[PDB]
Design a binder for this molecule. Structure first.
Ligand SMILES: Nc1ncnc2c1ncn2[C@@H]1O[C@H](CSCC[C@H](N)C(=O)O)[C@@H](O)[C@H]1O
Lengths: 265, 265
């Protein structure tokens, strides 16, 4: 009789909320997509085992083109659930799917889950200081994306931190690393020469957030660009002017250079 | 030797993640703070019942002043859990507590949970378009804070949305409503005349995020200022220019006026 959008969280099958699980367990049909983000600490099997249902995985095309033909038809006579990594409506276009549900006469409900958007709090950077966000897109062909560069500039100019989602090619199983993101930005700087991103720029890397032992490292681009941050997914953050307490955390927890402790008020 | 920062999520005792609940159960001691925010849809008893552990509630002073003397000692020879509403470390003062753990020779891990910071994605507004965040605080005595007004101005100026956390009197359990927030903003406008928040401003109200029946409403201040959005907690959003898809969601899902499709896009 209804459609539930249930988030699965950051890293493993246990990042789903209790609410999400109890509801998923009772649904008649369970669908899911795993292309918007990467859950590096679980497997389909482990999720199916936890939920106790067979999970039909949909591709980007299945959702974007046939969500109303594959999922919605069943939601009219049964309790159906649509699973996604992290939070279902964050950094995705899944919100529009609720409009499709409505027009098909299907009531929908949303069950949230931990999101990278807020998990960045673990980096010690004040969440309220994050500005506009952006995604570092893999260049393809003769098209070289640069919008994410402008976002960093605008935020930094206002003293705001910039969260950078990193590209992903689910089918090709290619997950952009922080290292690759840094390389691309240095290239954009050479083009625009805005002083936005250089070897001296302080940056923060968060890898496999959600895991019990995430990789959190802060430092200058010149020293981190070739560092190994472990398996994906990775997120890159270009901080704005730091509060002393932020700097203290980056140094004590993310092993940043003790010189950042001396902020230039 | 291990301290666990566990997020309780958005609204009720089921908003904790499966990972958080299980870890909390295996802990010898369980502490909790309910001053950075509250869990409006549940009670301490229901949370205790779910965890199956006695939960010692700590005040603000307990944490900020005596965290190392109340929680860390037991964490040296036991598994201790520290529960907080939402996602740990989103509240600005939490991060520092991890540094205290380190200096006490105690390991700490963070178990995430849904945060309102990310749950706002249910409003249909693109998460990447949210800029700096702010808190609307109740004026008191001869003190009238207005910095949240400037945040809205700078974000909107760059086409970004502004998330406004609303004040809360933790002990008294008094929640500032979106209505009160709107009234305060109109008063600040009358004083600053910046043309940032008026009867014609479009706003979005999200009430009881996390609940299965949250209230999602969007409209002009003149029409929503005295509307009843239901029980707390309420969150207010002043969106910037809208992408057509955001507007269609606000209209179809949040009951916004068709007018927004031409005036705010
Ligand atoms: N656990 C994690 N650690 C680091 N980055 C992560 C992450 N989970 C997601 N991301 C980042 O976000 C991108 C997917 S964007 C989709 C995000 C999702 N709805 C959420 O709420 O988290 C990834 O390519 C990656 O850069």
């Amino acid at each position: 009789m209804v459609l539930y959008f249930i988030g699965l969280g950051l890293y493993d099958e246990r990042d789903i909320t209790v609410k999400g699980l109890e509801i998923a367990k009772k649904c008649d049909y369970v669908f899911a997509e795993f292309y918007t983000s990467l859950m590096a600490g679980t497997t389909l099997g482990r999720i199916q085992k936890l939920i106790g249902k067979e999970i039909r995985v949909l591709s980007r095309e299945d959702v974007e083109l046939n969500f109303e033909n594959i999922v919605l038809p069943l939601a009219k006579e049964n309790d159906v659930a649509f699973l996604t990594p992290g939070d279902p409506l964050v950094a995705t276009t899944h919100a529009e799917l609720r409009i499709r549900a409505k027009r098909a006469g299907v009531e929908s409900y949303v069950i949230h889950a931990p999101s990278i958007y807020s998990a960045v709090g673990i980096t010690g950077l004040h969440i309220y200081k994050f500005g506009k966000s952006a995604t570092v897109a893999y260049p393809e062909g003769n098209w070289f994306p640069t919008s994410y560069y402008d976002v960093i500039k605008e935020n930094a100019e206002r003293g705001l931190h910039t969260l950078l989602f990193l590209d992903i090619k689910a089918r090709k199983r290619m997950y952009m690393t922080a290292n690759e993101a840094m390389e691309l930005l240095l290239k954009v700087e050479d083009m625009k020469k805005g002083g936005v991103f250089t070897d001296d720029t302080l940056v923060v890397v968060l890898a496999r957030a959600g895991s019990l032992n995430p990789t959190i490292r802060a430092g200058y681009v010149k020293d981190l660009i070739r560092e190994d941050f472990g398996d994906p997914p990775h997120i890159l953050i270009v901080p704005g002017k730091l509060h002393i307490v932020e700097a203290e955390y980056l140094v004590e927890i993310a092993g940043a250079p003790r010189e950042i402790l001396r902020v230039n008020v």
